Amino acid sequence: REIKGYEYQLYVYASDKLFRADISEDYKTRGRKLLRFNGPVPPP
């Protein structure tokens, strides 16, 4: 087939500061990492 996996790009308020993370997710084991995380960035 073709579909490898997914990727989420949220905006997370934690400790009252806006951070922006990217979670990878395997289309087969449905497991995931925490590819990245930054901030604080501003409200989108």
Binding site: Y11, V12, A14, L18, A21, G39
Partner: protein, 50 residues
């Protein structure tokens, strides 16, 4: 290839609590506590034979 703005519900706040938890462990930002998620939340669909 494809992208989408997915709803900001429970499956999306799990993705947020998970993020923070994994980074509480890397703590470039310390020991943060998860608040909630705002929008837009996005989702990339990846694909690749060769």
């Amino acid at each position: 290839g494809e992208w989408e703005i997915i709803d900001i519900g429970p499956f999306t706040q799990n993705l947020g609590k998970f993020a923070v938890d994994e980074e509480n462990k890397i703590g470039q930002y310390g020991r943060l506590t998860f608040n909630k998620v705002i929008r837009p939340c996005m989702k990339k669909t990846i694909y690749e034979n060769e």
